[PDB]
Amino acid sequence: MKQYLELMQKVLDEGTQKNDRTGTGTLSIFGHQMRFNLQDGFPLVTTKRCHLRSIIHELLWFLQGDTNIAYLHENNVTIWDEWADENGDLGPVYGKQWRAWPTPDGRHIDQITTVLNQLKNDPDSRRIIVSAWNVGELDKMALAPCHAFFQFYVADGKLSCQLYQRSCNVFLGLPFNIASYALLVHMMAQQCDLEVGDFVWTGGDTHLYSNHMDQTHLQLSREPRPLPKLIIKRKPESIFDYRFEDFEIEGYDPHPGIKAPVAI
Amino acid sequence: MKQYLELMQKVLDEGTQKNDRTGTGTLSIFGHQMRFNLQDGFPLVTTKRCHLRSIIHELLWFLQGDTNIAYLHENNVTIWDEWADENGDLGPVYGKQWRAWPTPDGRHIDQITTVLNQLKNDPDSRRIIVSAWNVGELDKMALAPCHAFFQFYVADGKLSCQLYQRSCNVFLGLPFNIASYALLVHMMAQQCDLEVGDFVWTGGDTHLYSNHMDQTHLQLSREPRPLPKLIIKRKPESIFDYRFEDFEIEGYDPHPGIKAPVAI
Ligand SMILES: *C1=C(F234[N][C@@]25=N3C(=O)C2=C(N=[C][C]3[C]N(C6=[C][C]=C(C(=O)[N][C]([C][C]C([O])=O)C([O])=O)[C]=[C]6)[C]N32)N54)C(=O)[N]C(=O)N1[C]1[C][C]([O])[C]([C]OP([O])([O])=O)O1
Ligand SMILES: *C1=C(F234[N][C@@]25=N3C(=O)C2=C(N=[C][C]3[C]N(C6=[C][C]=C(C(=O)[N][C]([C][C]C([O])=O)C([O])=O)[C]=[C]6)[C]N32)N54)C(=O)[N]C(=O)N1[C]1[C][C]([O])[C]([C]OP([O])([O])=O)O1
């Protein structure tokens, strides 16, 4: 994608050297914002082949407030294996915060339902927010949430959403994060009889690992193809009733995939 | 400021009509990001006279974890009067979340101290975050926090900070919010022996009230003057030891002030 390649180049030309928790150096910039008009096509990277399969399962998994990787396994999705403990538990990560943020007085807040309510009864609200950054539960999470905060906005019958991503591996994670949140907006919009608007992506520490330079230069030489189109086969009863088969991507013709090895 | 006037114009030319909780219409845009190189001067609006006095007191008040307006009153600062209850209490707003985020298990997390620790012992961290968006305590706050989340970043001896502001009254509140957070960065940097870097401002629902159009056009006709310089008279023992008199602004020559009436 045009906006995507632009950021990659930006990190290359303006990034400063910084090491991550391990030892792998990164080229890093702080503060970046992109905008994807969802009406312009589904924001799935075409400069390299991306697979929607894992993305869909993870999203549906988040929505069920599940934090154990069993569901993902039943569907052969192994993107969380690396973080799961012996029992397949990841701790109170995303799904738990989204569907059951625990209060000091013993309640569990359903932020997803709260948001659905607001979009339907008070679309003009400036508080339609979902936060996964529960300070009191950070110590128990397999890892602190990267995409930690997102806000919805309604204007002229169009639902928009801004995501704040504290840490972003441009080459490996961003393509996945964009499609994931773009899917969420389509689902929410359908459930609220709204048209899709913009998906604004905001990042904090945006970076590229030093050992991904070749892959970056390679991808940057490819010309972005037209964006595909997301097809939602049916309109479920609620946001919690979507099924993997309900989605279909039309017109996706990307360039070959590109491997990105990680150090350990 | 150049970046500031640019946003005002942007809201004017691209904002859509949207009403707020009351009935006052607003011109609104969703998703905007500005960057202030703090090395370039203190980001205090010169196209209209701004008073640092209330800004400093509020910041020092936030840092003491105080949520009762008494301190502000002892110093004749009345910006919170409007929201305070009979006893001067505002509920678990900013100061409380910053200094004592309550956990489900009975602990109170000091996010400000946590951040100081990270900046000194792990400056490369991508988790140096302070959140005031405590979902479980929203119902008790006089109002949901506008500037709800901020993140620090260290690179080349420079401390940077990104603020996410969910709702932003461009004319009335933004000038205040920028200076407030810019002050925080100078204080934090001093305490960590770091140089000041960038202050990145990210907004969600950025707007202008319909009854502030004249004032907006008027301010937009003024030429931004050079930015002043922030002087910190002394280096306190800790971040919690600053005093109003410790700050001094040098070279501030703004245009006349501009009143902005609000409907009720
Ligand atoms: C962070 C991240 F975050 N928290 C979290 N979340 C999520 O979601 C995740 C994680 N982890 C891991 C998991 C999985 N993932 C993924 C997916 C995918 C991938 C790949 O590789 N792929 C690609 C393609 C895609 C498509 O298909 O499209 C290829 O192959 O190439 C990877 C991964 C998800 N999950 N965790 C996110 O999200 N993001 C980001 O960026 N992050 C990161 C940041 C950094 O780099 C790290 C961390 O560090 P700190 O310090 O910050 O913590 O990570
Ligand atoms: C929101 C806001 F927020 N939450 C909160 N925080 C704060 O901080 C505040 C509030 N409120 C009020 C108070 C006070 N303030 C202020 C200050 C100042 C001002 C003025 O007026 N001033 C000017 C000047 C300045 C200087 O000096 O510089 C003139 O005069 O002109 C005003 C105000 C502060 N505090 N609360 C913030 O911050 N911001 C914003 O923007 N916000 C807003 C948004 C909107 O508009 C509203 C709300 O709604 P919702 O729905 O969103 O909630 O508000």
- For residue B35, the domain's CATH number is 3.30.572.10
A147, A12 contact by CB (below 8 A): no
Give the sign of the dihedral formed by CA B93, CA B230, CA B41, CA B123.
negative
Residue whose Cα lies nearest atom 37 of ligand 2: it is: B146
CA distance A71 to chain B (A): 27
Distance of alpha carbon B27 from alpha carbon B13, whole angstroms: 9
A206, A7 contact by CB (below 8 A): yes
Neighbouring C-alpha atoms within 13 Å toward the C-beta of A29 = 17
- Looking at A146, A161, A168, A192, which residue is catalytic? A146
Contacts of A31 in chain B (CB under 8 A): 33, 35, 160, 162, 198, 200, 202
- Tell me which H or E stretch contains A181: helix A174-191
Boundaries of domain holding B218: 2-264
Residue B232: φ, ψ to 5°: -110, 100
Tell me if B198 and A30 make a contact (CB, 8 A cut-off).
yes
Residue B157: φ, ψ to 5°: 70, 15
Sheet hosting strand A147-155, strand order edge to edge: A16-19, A25-37, A195-209, A158-169, A147-155, A129-131
- Tell me how far the alpha carbon of residue A59 lies from the centroid of ligand 1, in angstroms: 14
Contacts of A103 in chain B (CB under 8 A): 104, 135-137
Pairing status of strand B195-209 against strand B158-169: parallel
User: Helical H runs in A16-93?
Assistant: 52-63, 70-74
Pairing status of strand A158-169 against strand A195-209: parallel
Strand partners, B150: B130, B163
Experimental technique for the deposited model: X-ray
The resolution in Å comes to 2.3
**Residue B230: closest CA among B176, B199, B186:** B186
Helix axes A2-14, A174-191, angle to 10 degrees: 140
Which ligand is closest in space to the CA of residue A261?
A: 1
Residue B262 Cβ inside 6 Å of ligand 2? The answer reads: no
b (16+ CB within 10 A) / e for B84-114: beeeebbbbbbbbbbbbbbbbeeeebebbeb
Q: Which of B30, B133, B200 sits opposite A162 (nearest CB)?
A: B30
Give the sign of the dihedral formed by CA B240, CA B245, CA B251, CA B255.
positive
Instruction: Bin A110: left if φ > 0, else alpha if -120 < ψ < 50, else beta.
Output: beta
B79, B54 contact by CB (below 8 A): yes
DSSP for B72-127?
Answer: HHHTT--TTTTT--TTSB--S-HHHHHHHEEPTTS-EE-HHHHHHHHHHH-TT-S-
The DSSP letter of residue A257 is P
Distance of alpha carbon A232 from alpha carbon A249, whole angstroms: 9
Distance of alpha carbon A216 from alpha carbon A226, whole angstroms: 20
The token duo for A32 is 């970046």
Provide the domain count of chain A: 1
